[PDB]
């Protein structure tokens with residue numbers, strides 16, 4: 001096949017940078033500026049994803065630059081020159097605890113911002129955390145809103161306005177837990193944090209007879225003492241509060257951000273430095 | 287206000303026949319035929335409702351004749367000259383067990399047809415069961431698809447295709463009960479059947495200190511022996527199988543249709559007679 005004419009009109013396509021199950025990510029150059037962009041190709045919910053990407057505005061969430069709906073979908077985004085977090089943690093590799101904290105703080109700010117704006121990501125994983133440079137101290141941005149959920153008034157809320165004369169008991173039972181769907185993102189963050197800190201996954205079929213499903217529903221992560229000995233007590237404590245099986249008891253992003261592990265003025269200074277460094281501001285009054 | 291010009295072009299509007307929270311039902315005459323129709327007015331999901339009504343084809347489900355999207359919504363439907371089931375059961379009035387069986391058989395055929403076609407009604411109640419004539423032995427049709435749900439591939443199904451490395455435990459737990467949303471219609475049918483047979487609601491705040499919610503979630507309906515003494519054992523048995531709190535154990539429409547109470551050749555003959563009577567067939571080959 002060929003790239004669609006409208007895309008070719010504005011961009012010169014280059015090398016493949018990465019790939020997923022749905023397609024791949026290409027390097028491209030915007031003709032107008034001669035600057036690099038990334039183009040995510042999705043082989044034929046993208047429409048809602050685009051709507052979400054256009055509305056959001058946070059330094060730790062990827063921005064969309066362009067969109068082409070042709071034989072495949074083409075999403076033009078800023079190029080994250082550090083690539084995927086996945087490549088930093090694969091093969092038991094492990095980030096310094098300080099680096100983990102810097103990245104995780106930013107993931108939390110991003111997810112907090114999503115939840116404030118009524119968006120649940122639903123696919124948080126190292127592949128979807130992008131790094132701004134090849135330097136260890138860098139900005140991160142969350143990507144892939146392909147299976148995200150937009151919160152709004154539910155059918156349940158409409159249901160509860162009337163008298164339940166004809167209403168099934170399971171619907172009334174569901175009221176106890178409704179409105180905690182956002183907690184799935186906090187669980188995923190917990191798994192990512194566990195992986196970053198230890199270089200291995202908390203739940204895996206590797207050298208165990210307990211099924212993956214049972215490990216997860218029981219909350220019984222694989223704790224290898226020798227791997228963790230070098231990690232602080234505070235970091236593990238936060239992991240434990242995120243990997244709580246009851247979604248109503250699980251730490252929210254706000255609670256995680258208040259945790260002793262993230263009360264680190266050095267880390268927060270580094271983040272703020274990195275932010276101002278990124279930005280091309282233009283003159284301001286006064 | 288006035289009726290929209292496009293509606294006036296085709297219909298002459300007459301008296302109010304009934305009303306709901308969302309609007310009212312008017313008598314109207316189609317100019318082309320000089321025949322009576324009903325027009326449901328909904329004051330400004332109707333679009334999906336119309337899509338559902340147009341696709342369905344069953345003798346016990348109302349048919350749409352026309353639709354106007356103006357200042358309000360106008361849905362033109364066949365006129366059900368018997369009006370709402372609600373008016374037959376209000377004020378402790380009660381239908382003969384035989385009439386209950388005839389109506390309930392038809393409600394079951396209609397809901398069975400919905401579930402086969404991947405539609406959950408979600409608002410079954412006596413107001414939404416319409417009668418074809420003022421005669422006791424008549425056809426019934428289900429109406430109001432304003433809060434119905436269309437079944438299809440779920441997000442959960444897509445979720446289960448991958449490895450749950452990052453997946454929250456509540457999602458895996460939800461797998462045990464997923465795909466039983468249709469059972470809410472069977473519960474509502476059970477409540478309707480209870481009301482038709484007894485002339486009173488199974489769950490109500492009337493002369494009780496148990497909250498409505500607790501009556502329902504416990505499955506503890508109000509059984510007044512003296513009201514029920516004249517009702518058959520078989521009829522009550524079916525009610526009991528529909529008012530089961532566990533949605534996976536609850537009778538389906540298929541199970542209800544196989545129940546001893548509905549193994550009534552006289553009732554089924556009456557239904558078939560009523561069907562052929564309704565229809566204006568045109569010549570057939572052979």
Ligand SMILES: C/C(=N\NC(=N)NO)c1ccc(NC(=O)Nc2ccc(/C(C)=N/N/C(N)=N/O)cc2)cc1
Nearest residue numbers: 017018022025038040080081083084143144145146
């Ligand atoms: C610098 C670099 N690579 N450098 C290199 N290989 N040098 O040899 C590099 C590598 C990988 C990436 N990734 C990347 O950009 N991901 C990404 C993933 C998903 C989406 C979206 C919106 N998805 N939306 C949907 N619906 N999905 O299904 C967008 C971007 C970026 C830079």
Ligand SMILES: C/C(=N\NC(=N)NO)c1ccc(NC(=O)Nc2ccc(/C(C)=N/N/C(N)=N/O)cc2)cc1
Nearest residue numbers: 303304308311324326366367369370429430431432
């Ligand atoms: C013969 C008669 N009345 N005769 C009389 N009063 N004589 O004095 C009579 C009375 C009432 C009715 N009802 C009636 O037709 N209901 C009805 C309810 C709902 C809908 C729908 C599609 N709703 N869709 C939505 N989204 N809703 O929110 C359609 C029809 C019919 C005939």
Ligand SMILES: [Mg+2]
Nearest residue numbers: 123144146147
């Ligand atoms: Mg994804």
Ligand SMILES: [Mg+2]
Nearest residue numbers: 409430432433
């Ligand atoms: Mg309704």
